[PDB]
Design a protein around this ligand. Structure first.
Ligand SMILES: *N#CC(*)(*)(*)([O])C1(*)(*)=C(*)[C@@](*)(*)=[C@@](*)(*)C(*)=C1*
Ligand SMILES: O=Cc1ccccc1
Ligand SMILES: O=Cc1ccccc1
Ligand SMILES: O=Cc1ccccc1
Ligand SMILES: [C-]#N
Lengths: 260, 258
């Protein structure tokens, strides 16, 4: 039997650990270990998003998961959507606990521009927020932009290839969230020594109506990757629409970073 | 077309609206309206259980859902497990808004004993809490008993006929909660004029390892229902293990209260 791996899964903004409920047992029946992190004010975390003012506070459960790993363990760290920024933050802290970063339908930041750069780009270009509700909360350090998806938007742009049961599930669980774009605009650049040094791949879904092909190309062109995988027929919420194929991509990724 | 109904669905302690994620579209595909209430300190409600000190504050989202229905609208009110208690409290307030109460693997309280009666009875005989963590929280109402299920208990006792994905999902979402037995011990008995006047059916699952069959017969014996339905092979989380069959049973109920 080939050596198995520890996958750490990081969800998107407005969601929580729960998105991983299909993928987790698939990975584990193959003998892998899975930790599905729950980020601050996400999922059933007890804080509201208003109380989590910075992307570091938001990402803190991921940092604590990596910190607590036994000495010399390395993981496959998968970041979904805004989870991309989370995993880059973490790779800048704990580069040698990460064997490979998996950017899954994700923001892939660079080491050249401010940390918000790919988000601000997508914000200028995205059109069709639908019933999403935007607002902001003033903190002692600046305005914080918040968002709560609307359900029409959800159906059309994130979940359009998911089983209806999954759409319904998400409507009972999604929460108000943030992309922390003001905080990220003020933060020091991601480093070449930390984040830049870690191996990285990109997994894209062919029918992602959030993160389009052009925008990925663009991000990859700013900050190259080892390898790109495509999941055929997946919507943004590929771990729900096509968990089997997402499994297949993550097993391929495990095989390229084979242990010993 | 047969007249369709509005089902209001009330989840169990330590869980939330999310448990209904399979049953809701089944009901909606058949043309019905569904409201899955998210009770206080449950699911993604932003309150911790420690901030919800009485069963009345726990139940408030249900009462507010019934209160905001248009006039003369009646619902099929379905209460799962401790959700029985919630729905009984709701019936004693808005009896005329409920066509029928559906006790689903539920606690069925009576109008003669203290509201906690059926829970105190199960609690005495129940054993094997497994890895469940019990704790105490002191309030201005006296001590409150809290519980958080442990994952081995959940697998064996709630989720054993569920798909593994459902079990994993629950592990990600279940929360510390309470059966409010102290508050329910002290509360005024449910009334004949409110709760007791409302039509009620019972729906039981044949492989429920929380609520034994004998316990159910004892409850119905203290307090009759119009009719009893059974879901063959269901564990306690019958909405997850046998959603289709639950749908079948709820259609049958709806057909009768046309
Ligand atoms: N309410 C209820 C039951 O589903 C239950 C809740 C927590 C633990 C065991 C049983
Ligand atoms: O996960 C993607 C996303 C997109 C828009 C709003 C919130 C989350
Ligand atoms: O669609 C996701 C997103 C994130 C940041 C800005 C705009 C869009
Ligand atoms: O009171 C005992 C008990 C047991 C399981 C669920 C709810 C109550
Ligand atoms: C998008 N998170």
């Amino acid at each position: 039997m080939e050596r198995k791996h520890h996958f750490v899964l990081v969800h998107n903004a407005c969601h929580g650990a729960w998105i991983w409920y299909k993928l987790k047992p698939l990975l584990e029946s193959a003998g892998h270990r899975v930790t599905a992190v729950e980020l601050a004010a996400s999922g059933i975390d007890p804080r509201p998003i208003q109380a989590v003012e910075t992307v570091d506070e938001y990402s803190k459960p991921l940092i604590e998961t990596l910190k607590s790993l036994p000495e010399n363990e390395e993981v496959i760290l998968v970041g979904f959507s805004f989870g991309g920024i989370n995993i880059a933050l973490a790779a800048d802290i704990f580069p040698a606990k990460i064997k490979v970063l998996v950017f899954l339908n994700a923001f892939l930041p660079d080491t050249t521009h401010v940390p918000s750069h790919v988000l601000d780009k997508l914000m200028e270009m995205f059109g069709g927020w639908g019933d999403t509700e935007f607002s902001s909360h003033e903190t002692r350090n600046g305005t914080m932009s918040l968002l709560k998806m609307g359900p029409k938007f959800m159906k059309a742009r994130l979940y359009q290839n998911c089983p209806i049961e999954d759409y319904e599930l998400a409507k009972m669980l999604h929460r108000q969230g943030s992309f922390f774009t003001e905080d990220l605009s003020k933060k020091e650049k991601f480093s070449e020594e930390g984040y830049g040094s870690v191996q990285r791949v990109y997994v894209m879904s062919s029918e992602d109506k959030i993160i389009p092909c052009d925008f990925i190309r663009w991000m990859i062109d700013n900050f190259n990757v080892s390898k790109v995988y495509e999941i055929d027929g997946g919507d943004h919420m590929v771990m729900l629409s096509k968990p089997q194929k997402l499994f297949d991509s993550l097993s391929a990724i495990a095989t390229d970073y084979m242990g010993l």
